[PDB]
Structure formats: structure tokens, C-alpha cells
Amino acid sequence: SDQQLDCALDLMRRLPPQQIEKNLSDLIDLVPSLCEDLLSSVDQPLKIARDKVVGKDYLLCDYNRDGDSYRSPWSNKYDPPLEDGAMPSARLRKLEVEANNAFDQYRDLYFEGGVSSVYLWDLDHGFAGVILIKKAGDGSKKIKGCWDSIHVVEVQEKSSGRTAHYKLTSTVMLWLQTNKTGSGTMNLGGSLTRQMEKDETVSDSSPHIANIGRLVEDMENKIRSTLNEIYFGKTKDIVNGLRSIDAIP
Amino acid sequence: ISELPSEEGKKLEHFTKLRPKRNKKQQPTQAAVCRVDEGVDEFFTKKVT
Amino acid sequence: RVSDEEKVRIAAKFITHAPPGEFNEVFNDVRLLLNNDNLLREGAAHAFAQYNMDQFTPVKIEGYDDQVLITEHGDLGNGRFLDPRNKISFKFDHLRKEASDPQPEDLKQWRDACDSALRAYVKDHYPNGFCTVYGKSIDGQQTIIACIESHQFQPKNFWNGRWRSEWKFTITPPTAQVAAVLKIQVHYYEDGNVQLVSHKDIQDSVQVSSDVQTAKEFIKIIENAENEYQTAISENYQTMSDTTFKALRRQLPVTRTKIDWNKILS
Secondary structure, eight states, X not given: OHHHHHHHHHHTTTSOGGGHHHHHHHHHHHXXXXXXXXXXXXXXXXXXEEEGGGTEEEEEOGGGEETTXXXXXXXXXEESOOTTOOOOOHHHHHHHHHHHHHHHHHHHHHHSSOEEEEEEEEXXXXXXXXXXXXXXXXXXXXXXXXXXXXXXXXXEEOSSOSXXXXXXXXXXXXXXXXXXXXXXXXXXXXXXXXXXXXXXXXXXXXXXXXHHHHHHHHHHHHHHHHHHHIIIIIHHHHHHHHOOSSOOO | OOOOOOOSSSXXXXXXXXXXXXXXXXXXXXXXXXXXXXXXXXXXXXXXX | XXXXXXXXXXXXXXXXXXXXXXXXXXXXXXXXXXXXXXXXXXXXXXXXXXXXXXXXXXXXXXXXXXXXXXXXXXXXXXXXXXXXXXXEEEEEETTTTEEEEEEEOOOHHHXXXXXXXXXXXXXXXXXXXXXXXXXXXETTEEEEEEEEEEEEEEGGGTEEEEEEEEXXXXXXXXXXXXXXXXXXXXXXXXXXXXXXXXXXXXXXEEEOOOHHHHHHHXXXXXXXXXXXXXXXXXXXXXXXXXXXXXXXXXXXXXXXXOOOHHHHTO
């Protein structure tokens, strides 16, 4: 059933990524024993909830889910309200709020809009975080686009504490669609994932959020490039090898 | 019925398996809670019929 | 929880949503998860056949050197399919995708002519295309149905793609009402899962004359439509590239340099 999980994950590399939500819930119905793991391994399009209390938006993912509730990085409350959901230590909550600000500036500089959310949670020897970002297009040219970032980072502090080890697993979902007399309906969707593993110095001048940010930055810069190569280059070249306007020599 | 031929060479690797884990207190009631996606239904239904 | 019935309903659903060239993998995955082969055999049975018929799965019949498409228009019932070119029934295995037991079979002249012009057309424009033409009566009216399937399977480089076109010319001389569905799917799955899903509908009305004359007009009409479709798709890719994508994430901030995280955290 480590074997089952694999098959499950293999299947999800293959079913139209556009229907991940319905496919995942169907998949868990098929193999319930994989519920907890399927929910933390299968990426879904990010959703947005309003945080009434502060009237700000935030992003949803298994990592801020408990019961059927999601926690706001603003007010730190669960919604719907939940009796004793997982919470960061007050220490961690403090850093988390600081990672939220830090990455709101990141979001701004690189996306010039969109939403961001950062959720941290405690680990035995360090912590983990997930940095989430969503940016939609304008609908200029009747083409819809949405960009989804999911950066899940593990941080291993060593007793020295002069350094830490960082495991970043990064996903971006890119979603484009259009209906033109052309052409007709066209939906180009999916996601790329990549891992990094680095040791960085943790100091007052080089803090965790700086280290993590720099990783998340190298990574998106990379993936942005590959998304551009894959979507509008590779899948394009494939379409044009199925059929040719010009008669074949 | 039995296992059919695969021409892929190697198994696919799932990176999200190895991510950090977050223990919850209350487990999900449903996989979803409370559009990417447009045109995709009719791709699997549209027919000259 | 759910019944074993709902389990196969789910299993079947997944199979029919298998991407081009990936039926075998999706099948292996589902069968392991269901973990009940006679439940699979029983329950997904309809799925296998739909998949091949929907996908316009092509098959070689030993003896003929024209490949034939599995399509619901060729569905003779009871495991068999028709090959209108060579006028034969053949048994077809939906999991192995093999034809067997070719047997003789019983708008002839128009399907023939249309067929000829279409083979010509397919061999010119589709690198690995095949086609199949049916002439039949649908609820009192005589119709030509021209299916085209073409694909490229590159499993070793984690990608597959397929074009299908399906054209229905229902003939009421001197007019023919034209309907067509065009479908393209591309899947690239290295370190991810990106898919193109496209389809265009066509409704039109056209002139009709003699078998041979008419056939050529039909093929010239088809060629035209499939160019607009393909061209427009290429245009979409270009607008997506240089307009929409760039509006999602900048390549660098406006400062033309990477972020100063020291400054950020101040």
C-alpha cells in the first residue's frame, strides 16, 4: 500500500489535471485507507476564503486544514470554528506572521497582485512551512490564466543553530483556457514540481525567512522558465507533429 | 484480465510523498469542503451524433 | 463508504479518462486499487470498449495493409467491428487491441469515392494518420461519416498526443448538412502533469453533385476547416505566450535584480 499509494499518485499524473478535485475525491472513495496521504501528496488548485474578522483573503490547502476547517494566517482562527485544531506554538505563530509579511512583499515584487499565504507548523527538531500564492489574469484578449504556487519547506535546525538544512518541494499549477471560433475551446492545464536541498547559515544577518525566501525565489525563477518551455514550446511542438497544414514531402 | 505492457522504461517518481507531514487533530469528513476546468467536460462528451 | 458497484463505477470512469497512449498504465493502476479482477472484468467492461471507440483506436488486420479505426460507427455488436474499406467484420480485443477472425460482410459508391479522397488527404497532412469512412442511414437519411485519428507516443520522454476528427455529411441532394467534431489532446508528464485539451464544433451546409465531384469538395472542405482549427490553436499558443503568461509572474521584479531579503525583512 506504499505500492497502492504509488499507483494512486501515478494515476493522478495521468488524469486530466483540470479535474483534480473531483478525481481526488473519487480516488479516495476508491481507496479510503489512502485518505490522509492522498490529501497531503496531491496538489489541488488553490481556493480563497474570506477571513471575516479581518476582512482579508487567504489561501486554502491541506496544510491549513483541520477537520473540515481552515485556519487563517491573519486571525489564527479556524473556520468553521473547530474545537482544538492544530496550532503553531506562540513562538512559531510569531515567526509565521513575519513570514506572511515577508512573502507578501515577495508576491508584490514578482506578481504585482494576487494573494499570498504562509502556514507554519512545529516539528521535533525545527519546523515546516508552506508558502502559497495565487495570481489570476485580467481576461485581456479573452484568455483566462491562473498561476498557483505551492512551496513546502522543511527546516532542520542543528544544535549549533549556526546553520540549518532546508528541504524545499515546489509546485506551480499553471491554468489557461479560451473559447474562440478557431480553435474552439482550449484548456491547457497542469503543474511542474521540483525539489531542492540546501544548507544555509542561520544568523541575525541571514535568518530562516531570508534563507527560505531565497530558495523559493531561485525555484520559481527556474520553474517559470520551464513552464514557458513546456507549455508554449513542448506541447506546441507536439500538436504540430500530429498534423501539418503544408503537404508532407 | 491481467497486467498490460508498459513502454515507459522507469516508474514515475512522486516528490510530494517526501514532503514534511502535519498531524491534524480532527480528520476530514469529506475530500472537498465548502473552475479550471472549462470546456473539459464536453471534450469527453462532444460527438457528431 | 461505497459499494463495490460504486467502486467500479469509479474505476470505469478513470479508465475512460485515460490520456492517449496511457490506457495500459491507467488500467494497471486502477486494477491494483480496485483489487478485484472479476469485479473489474464485469464492471469496467463497457469502459474498455468506449475508450477504444472514443479514441478512434487504430488496428492492423493481418492480411490487409490499411489500418482500421475502432469507432462506434463500426460497432457491429458482440465484440465485432466493421472495416468498410475491405468490407469485413473482425473480432476485436479491447485490452490487447487485437483484431482477429476477419469475416466477409454485406451509399456504397459515395463512401468509396469519399474514402479515396480522404486517404490521399490524410497521407499528405498527418504523419501517422489513418481514417475510416462509413456510409449508412441515420433515421431515414443517408450519411457519410469520416473519422481521422493520428498520434505520437513517446513514452520514454513522458509525452503523448492525439488528433481526432469526425465529420458527418448527411446528404439531402442537392444539399448536405455538415457536422464535425475536432479534438486534440496532449499530455506531458515529466516532473509533472500538463495537458492540452481542445475541441471545436462545426455546423455547416454545403452543395452536392456527383459521387466523385462531391467527394473532392468534401475533402477540400475538411482540409480547410482543419487548417483554421490548427492555425487558430497556434495563434492561441502565441497570445498565451507573449501576453497572458507574462501577466502572471514577472521574470524579475521591476528593479531588474533579485530580491534583497535583508531589505525585505526591515
